[PDB]
mmCIF file of all heavy atoms in Angstrom:
data_model
loop_
_atom_site.group_PDB
_atom_site.id
_atom_site.type_symbol
_atom_site.label_atom_id
_atom_site.label_comp_id
_atom_site.label_asym_id
_atom_site.label_seq_id
_atom_site.Cartn_x
_atom_site.Cartn_y
_atom_site.Cartn_z
ATOM 1 N N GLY B 96 65.229 126.141 126.539
ATOM 2 C CA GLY B 96 65.295 124.698 126.584
ATOM 3 C C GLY B 96 66.759 124.244 126.360
ATOM 4 O O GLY B 96 67.608 125.108 126.211
ATOM 5 N N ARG B 97 66.983 122.921 126.363
ATOM 6 C CA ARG B 97 68.388 122.489 126.235
ATOM 7 C C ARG B 97 68.573 121.169 125.421
ATOM 8 O O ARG B 97 67.634 120.500 124.946
ATOM 9 C CB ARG B 97 69.075 122.435 127.587
ATOM 10 C CG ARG B 97 68.357 121.666 128.649
ATOM 11 C CD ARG B 97 69.055 122.020 129.952
ATOM 12 N NE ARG B 97 68.598 121.045 131.005
ATOM 13 C CZ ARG B 97 69.298 120.923 132.216
ATOM 14 N NH1 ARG B 97 70.330 121.634 132.352
ATOM 15 N NH2 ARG B 97 68.819 120.073 133.077
ATOM 16 N N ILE B 98 69.838 120.739 125.411
ATOM 17 C CA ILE B 98 70.274 119.721 124.565
ATOM 18 C C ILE B 98 71.599 119.161 125.183
ATOM 19 O O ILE B 98 72.474 119.902 125.563
ATOM 20 C CB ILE B 98 70.666 120.199 123.108
ATOM 21 C CG1 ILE B 98 69.392 120.547 122.368
ATOM 22 C CG2 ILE B 98 71.469 119.220 122.340
ATOM 23 C CD1 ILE B 98 68.557 119.342 121.956
ATOM 24 N N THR B 99 71.689 117.827 125.255
ATOM 25 C CA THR B 99 72.847 117.171 125.846
ATOM 26 C C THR B 99 73.972 116.880 124.864
ATOM 27 O O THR B 99 73.858 117.145 123.600
ATOM 28 C CB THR B 99 72.408 115.873 126.514
ATOM 29 O OG1 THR B 99 71.968 114.936 125.495
ATOM 30 C CG2 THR B 99 71.367 116.061 127.554
ATOM 31 N N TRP B 100 75.044 116.487 125.390
ATOM 32 C CA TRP B 100 76.298 116.115 124.573
ATOM 33 C C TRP B 100 75.967 115.039 123.531
ATOM 34 O O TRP B 100 76.656 114.945 122.517
ATOM 35 C CB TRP B 100 77.452 115.650 125.408
ATOM 36 C CG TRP B 100 78.184 116.690 126.157
ATOM 37 C CD1 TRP B 100 77.650 117.733 126.824
ATOM 38 C CD2 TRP B 100 79.592 116.872 126.337
ATOM 39 N NE1 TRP B 100 78.589 118.538 127.398
ATOM 40 C CE2 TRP B 100 79.811 118.038 127.143
ATOM 41 C CE3 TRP B 100 80.674 116.078 125.963
ATOM 42 C CZ2 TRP B 100 81.111 118.407 127.440
ATOM 43 C CZ3 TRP B 100 81.971 116.519 126.295
ATOM 44 C CH2 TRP B 100 82.190 117.658 127.082
ATOM 45 N N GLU B 101 74.935 114.255 123.770
ATOM 46 C CA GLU B 101 74.500 113.244 122.848
ATOM 47 C C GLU B 101 73.324 113.713 121.957
ATOM 48 O O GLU B 101 73.261 113.325 120.853
ATOM 49 C CB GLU B 101 74.099 111.947 123.533
ATOM 50 C CG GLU B 101 72.784 112.003 124.343
ATOM 51 C CD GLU B 101 72.386 110.756 124.985
ATOM 52 O OE1 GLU B 101 73.082 110.361 125.992
ATOM 53 O OE2 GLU B 101 71.360 110.134 124.503
ATOM 54 N N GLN B 102 72.518 114.564 122.556
ATOM 55 C CA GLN B 102 71.360 115.158 121.830
ATOM 56 C C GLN B 102 71.888 116.120 120.784
ATOM 57 O O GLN B 102 71.183 116.412 119.867
ATOM 58 C CB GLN B 102 70.414 115.846 122.782
ATOM 59 C CG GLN B 102 68.922 115.590 122.452
ATOM 60 C CD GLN B 102 67.962 116.296 123.414
ATOM 61 O OE1 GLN B 102 68.383 116.756 124.551
ATOM 62 N NE2 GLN B 102 66.727 116.359 123.089
ATOM 63 N N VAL B 103 73.109 116.524 120.985
ATOM 64 C CA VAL B 103 73.773 117.326 119.915
ATOM 65 C C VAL B 103 74.481 116.374 118.927
ATOM 66 O O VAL B 103 74.690 116.750 117.711
ATOM 67 C CB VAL B 103 74.790 118.318 120.553
ATOM 68 C CG1 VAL B 103 75.894 117.615 121.346
ATOM 69 C CG2 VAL B 103 75.426 119.229 119.416
ATOM 70 N N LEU B 104 74.869 115.217 119.382
ATOM 71 C CA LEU B 104 75.524 114.216 118.514
ATOM 72 C C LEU B 104 74.573 113.513 117.556
ATOM 73 O O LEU B 104 74.867 113.260 116.456
ATOM 74 C CB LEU B 104 76.289 113.237 119.332
ATOM 75 C CG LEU B 104 77.664 113.647 119.795
ATOM 76 C CD1 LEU B 104 78.280 112.743 120.859
ATOM 77 C CD2 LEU B 104 78.570 113.818 118.585
ATOM 78 N N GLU B 105 73.357 113.274 118.111
ATOM 79 C CA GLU B 105 72.316 112.614 117.308
ATOM 80 C C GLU B 105 71.748 113.543 116.279
ATOM 81 O O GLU B 105 71.004 113.071 115.413
ATOM 82 C CB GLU B 105 71.215 112.092 118.230
ATOM 83 C CG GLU B 105 70.336 113.152 118.875
ATOM 84 C CD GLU B 105 69.075 112.601 119.510
ATOM 85 O OE1 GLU B 105 68.795 111.402 119.346
ATOM 86 O OE2 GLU B 105 68.396 113.382 120.267
ATOM 87 N N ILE B 106 72.058 114.833 116.312
ATOM 88 C CA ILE B 106 71.600 115.788 115.346
ATOM 89 C C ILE B 106 72.559 115.886 114.137
ATOM 90 O O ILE B 106 72.117 115.890 112.983
ATOM 91 C CB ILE B 106 71.383 117.180 115.957
ATOM 92 C CG1 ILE B 106 70.225 117.103 116.977
ATOM 93 C CG2 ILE B 106 71.082 118.191 114.926
ATOM 94 C CD1 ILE B 106 69.977 118.476 117.648
ATOM 95 N N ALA B 107 73.860 115.858 114.445
ATOM 96 C CA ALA B 107 74.877 115.760 113.441
ATOM 97 C C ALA B 107 74.613 114.557 112.556
ATOM 98 O O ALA B 107 74.816 114.577 111.354
ATOM 99 C CB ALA B 107 76.245 115.717 114.033
ATOM 100 N N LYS B 108 74.073 113.519 113.192
ATOM 101 C CA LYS B 108 73.646 112.324 112.538
ATOM 102 C C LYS B 108 72.662 112.606 111.433
ATOM 103 O O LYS B 108 72.654 111.969 110.409
ATOM 104 C CB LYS B 108 72.981 111.335 113.516
ATOM 105 C CG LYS B 108 73.831 110.099 113.875
ATOM 106 C CD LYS B 108 73.280 109.347 114.986
ATOM 107 C CE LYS B 108 71.908 108.780 114.721
ATOM 108 N NZ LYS B 108 71.854 107.675 113.738
ATOM 109 N N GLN B 109 71.779 113.609 111.665
ATOM 110 C CA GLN B 109 70.752 113.997 110.685
ATOM 111 C C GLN B 109 71.237 114.787 109.518
ATOM 112 O O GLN B 109 70.689 114.678 108.472
ATOM 113 C CB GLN B 109 69.529 114.525 111.374
ATOM 114 C CG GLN B 109 68.204 114.327 110.637
ATOM 115 C CD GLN B 109 66.962 114.975 111.294
ATOM 116 O OE1 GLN B 109 67.106 115.759 112.175
ATOM 117 N NE2 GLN B 109 65.785 114.647 110.737
ATOM 118 N N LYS B 110 72.218 115.579 109.715
ATOM 119 C CA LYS B 110 72.706 116.525 108.735
ATOM 120 C C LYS B 110 74.066 116.243 108.203
ATOM 121 O O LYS B 110 74.689 117.146 107.686
ATOM 122 C CB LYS B 110 72.578 118.000 109.194
ATOM 123 C CG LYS B 110 71.139 118.551 109.164
ATOM 124 C CD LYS B 110 71.160 120.094 109.435
ATOM 125 C CE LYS B 110 71.542 120.883 108.299
ATOM 126 N NZ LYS B 110 70.496 120.979 107.286
ATOM 127 N N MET B 111 74.573 115.043 108.352
ATOM 128 C CA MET B 111 75.948 114.700 107.943
ATOM 129 C C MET B 111 76.182 114.534 106.439
ATOM 130 O O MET B 111 77.324 114.779 106.013
ATOM 131 C CB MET B 111 76.447 113.550 108.724
ATOM 132 C CG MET B 111 75.405 112.533 109.067
ATOM 133 S SD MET B 111 76.075 111.268 110.199
ATOM 134 C CE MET B 111 77.039 112.314 111.235
ATOM 135 N N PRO B 112 75.194 114.087 105.616
ATOM 136 C CA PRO B 112 75.519 114.051 104.189
ATOM 137 C C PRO B 112 75.599 115.415 103.469
ATOM 138 O O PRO B 112 75.445 115.471 102.306
ATOM 139 C CB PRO B 112 74.389 113.251 103.561
ATOM 140 C CG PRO B 112 73.268 113.334 104.582
ATOM 141 C CD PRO B 112 73.955 113.417 105.912
ATOM 142 N N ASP B 113 75.928 116.435 104.297
ATOM 143 C CA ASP B 113 75.908 117.832 103.842
ATOM 144 C C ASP B 113 77.213 118.494 103.890
ATOM 145 O O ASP B 113 78.053 118.382 102.943
ATOM 146 C CB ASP B 113 74.884 118.603 104.662
ATOM 147 C CG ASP B 113 73.474 118.060 104.582
ATOM 148 O OD1 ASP B 113 73.161 117.042 105.272
ATOM 149 O OD2 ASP B 113 72.617 118.623 103.935
ATOM 150 N N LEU B 114 77.410 119.264 104.955
ATOM 151 C CA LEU B 114 78.590 120.166 105.227
ATOM 152 C C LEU B 114 79.904 119.893 104.401
ATOM 153 O O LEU B 114 79.937 120.210 103.201
ATOM 154 C CB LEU B 114 78.934 120.210 106.691
ATOM 155 C CG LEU B 114 77.967 119.632 107.716
ATOM 156 C CD1 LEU B 114 78.616 119.394 109.043
ATOM 157 C CD2 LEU B 114 76.765 120.517 107.872
ATOM 158 N N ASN B 115 80.913 119.402 105.149
ATOM 159 C CA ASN B 115 82.186 119.114 104.502
ATOM 160 C C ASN B 115 82.965 118.056 105.326
ATOM 161 O O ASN B 115 83.423 117.107 104.669
ATOM 162 C CB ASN B 115 83.005 120.356 104.283
ATOM 163 C CG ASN B 115 83.114 120.773 102.849
ATOM 164 O OD1 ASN B 115 84.169 120.814 102.322
ATOM 165 N ND2 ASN B 115 82.031 121.040 102.222
ATOM 166 N N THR B 116 83.040 118.204 106.600
ATOM 167 C CA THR B 116 83.765 117.276 107.404
ATOM 168 C C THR B 116 83.048 115.944 107.578
ATOM 169 O O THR B 116 81.858 115.869 107.838
ATOM 170 C CB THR B 116 83.865 117.833 108.894
ATOM 171 O OG1 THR B 116 83.872 116.772 109.799
ATOM 172 C CG2 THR B 116 82.706 118.759 109.136
#
Side-chain angles (χ1 to χ4, degrees):
Chain B
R97 54 193 193 164
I98 287 291
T99 63
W100 284 41
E101 71 176 71
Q102 219 179 348
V103 62
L104 277 171
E105 69 169 350
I106 294 182
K108 253 171 62 72
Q109 204 182 11
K110 283 187 80 74
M111 34 191 37
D113 300 76
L114 347 162
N115 252 240
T116 149

